[model samples]
Target: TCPFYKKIPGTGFTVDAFQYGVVEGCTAYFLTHFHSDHYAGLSKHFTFPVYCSEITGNLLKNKLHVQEQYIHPLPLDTECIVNGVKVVLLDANHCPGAVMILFYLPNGTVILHTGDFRADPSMERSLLADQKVHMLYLDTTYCSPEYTFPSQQEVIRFAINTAFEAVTLNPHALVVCGTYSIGKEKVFLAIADVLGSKVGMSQEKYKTLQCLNIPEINSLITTDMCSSLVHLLPMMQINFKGLQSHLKKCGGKYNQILAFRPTGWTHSNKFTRIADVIPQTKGNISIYGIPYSEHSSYLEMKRFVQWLKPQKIIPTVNVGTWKSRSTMEKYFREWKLEAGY
Candidate 1:
């Protein structure tokens, strides 16, 4: 079964499927977030009403062109009923409008779907610690023991300070803060607040932040490229050659260009071969890989599972034919033993 969906034993609502229309007689649909991968093949004219956060519903209407009548906004921590099943939305802590879906079935079965989030204490206090989770649809993006990284707070702090340091060192330098379209807005916002400058983003990104309706975010966005000392560049534009090409258009105005790529993939020894900061310089461009991620690391996931005590765990990613039920059980058992659960 795909991790995107889990059917309630006695209900018509199918939770979190990209192509819910294909599922015959589907009573309703639940969307965890607005991430592209989660809604890859989603139709623009989806007939079923999608139960999701307000921001997600807005994006579906404004960006994806879905009909307003089919969008249902679920407030965080509030319980709602649709198709005779109790459902609640919790903050996912991954992006501005991301949420975790909790389904309370008629048969008294409780299921949790962690849509792509870091395990934060607030989320635990809100949903997990006091509840009985029969099954968990886990976002096992970094479920291996080798993917350890610092907390989101620590990593965001590092990114802000590092950007400040780069700008301080080279007054005329262009500090390119690399990030995705949606996630990692925290890093750029923090830098803007601390530095007392606006963040330059594309028009599309600015519209997205407006749709997000984050109070602190809208005031800090700027269309001018050089409006702030630190520029918010797309994650894909942080490479060496990319930086070189971009700098060529600057006409030697910048003394240096510092590119910071905030991602968890930098933890891979097979890649950057470093745990924390991996620095590389080419020409007049300097690139740094910071340990910043929205997803939970292996240790965090293990601790979360132990605390939640779900009877079954279905991984959200990296599962192939060879990785059977026994394999999943083995991984969970090993992780539990290591965590002393």
Candidate 2:
């Protein structure tokens, strides 16, 4: 079901195609967000125009050093004609600047390219609410019944409650929240606000956040490790040895270390309840793997498809093998038919 990661069928425009060098018959590029995976191979050397949200446009210029002339920043909920096709950017609810690219072609075809979204009830009232979507390019990151889990609010509530209790009890335990290039911000941001602790992160991440309009996080951010107990580090430093070594860099500022690695992958087949997804501790260090995901869960995706009632679905993730592709389509087909689409 997958060809080029970015090319939208029946259109010359491509969505999130930086990783793939040459998309055959591609004329323009469109970005859904600023995540490295979506914008990996992109750089200032691009020869064509790029379209994205306003915040994402700022990020492209600031982070990736892409030139401004070729970068087209589109406003949300506003219909704009790009190369004669009507285009609109709807909030993806996944991360800041993330959006579901909506296309209305001259032939009256409606296509929704969901670029890594966490579908919410609010979307049912969005622009795509009444429009009969002819084709849906879904971000099927977790597209199976086995991938079902609690909502983001529930997961974040659990993470904050557990971490807050642990830190309040320990008092001096340093808390580290693992994160990616972007997203999963609500977890650590909540922790920082609730505890009134500054967020410790690298200068690059700090700069990246500055491009966004998060004024509340401004005063809460700090580069000094000794200043804040809540540290936001990359997920690559999630292992025991790496975290332990980072703990040592505190210069004995804290007594113990408690890290929270947040992602949906942590909620695998074995865990049914949220709390059942446990944490690991070695010596004075403890790491909790929380099911904090930015992508839609299996149930959420099914609910979204059922609600949208799109005639066709083309997944944007896990389409490498025929078996995997069929498995995902099976779910989509079942949900759409059940919804009487």
Candidate 3:
């Protein structure tokens, strides 16, 4: 079930397999999102037609330099005929351009590939309610029973309050949120919006957000460092050493750092309480790690697996080794057995 994301045998289609290079047998490529892990090897040397969401295609062209001719950007939730099959795009809710793909094949297999999605109850509606999914390529990132997450809004609210409390106490505090290139835009955006603070961005980050093209966020972002209280920085820049040096390098304008490191690994069955979510503090810089994850929770994945009940369940992440793959397969086996499917 795991050891996944390879070329399908008869379909000649590849999903998030660019790191394996452009294989000869696979003629059509599908990208789920703009994460560095998903589209690592996609470059100018890449051949074959690439199919993905509109924002992903734009990023490939404007950022990765893939030519426009080879890129096909599909519209959301629409069944567009591509290569003789009907392909529909559903919002993945993982990032700006992330989408879950639905392919109705010539034989009516009803293949569903959830690239990286946060499972939602709303998925039970529409074509999903009536249709039977034959093969599902699912994101099993948090499929273990030990993992659980609060709602995105719940987690976002916690971060806002935490930062809000810190900045209120010290007026010279910088509310920093760590994020990747594409995801976690909502965290800093919410904090800045609530705080009514100016947003700061590096020139490189500014260019990437330009490709994202959100008008409201652009109005909040500025190149001036000290002008903005809330700033978004890369994941690598959020560490204690990184934050300490960052504050040092910025002169005497800023006094302390109230930062957020948002990822899935920060919470588990042992640490879900609001008082004990997760926090790290050192000297003037205080870091709070929140479980504001892009991936589905363990309970959410189970609900999806139970509701969808696809004929074949294939895992998409943590499949580098057979042992890890077996662990995920064990979860799948147990879930399906409990669901009696």
Which candidate leads in TM-score? Answer: 2
- Name every residue pair that clashes in candidate 3: none
- C-alpha lDDT values of all predictions: 0.75, 0.83, 0.82
- Candidate 3 per-residue lDDT, tens place, 1-341, comes to 21245555457677888876547677688898999988978997677899998889889998888988999988897779877778788988798999998888788689888999998889888467768899888888877777776788888888888888878888888888887768888888888888887778788787777777576766777888778888878889998999988888678889999898887755353655755666778889888877777889888888988999989987877776788788888888898899899
Q: List the residue pairs that clash in candidate 2.
A: none
Candidate 1 global TM-score: 0.89
Colliding residue pairs in candidate 1: none
Cα error, candidate 2, residue 3 (Å):
2.4
Candidate order by decreasing TM-score:
2, 3, 1
Candidate 1 lDDT, tens digit per residue, 224-337? Answer: 775666677678888987888877776677878877777765536345423356578976788877777788887787778877877778777666556654566688987667
Which candidate, 1 or 3, would have the higher TM-score against the true structure? 3
Q: What TM-score do all the candidates reach, one by one?
A: 0.89, 0.94, 0.92
| Alpha-carbon deviation at 249 in model 2, angstroms | 1.4
Provide backbone clash counts, one per model.
0, 0, 0
Query: Which lDDT value does model 1 have at 58?
Result: 81
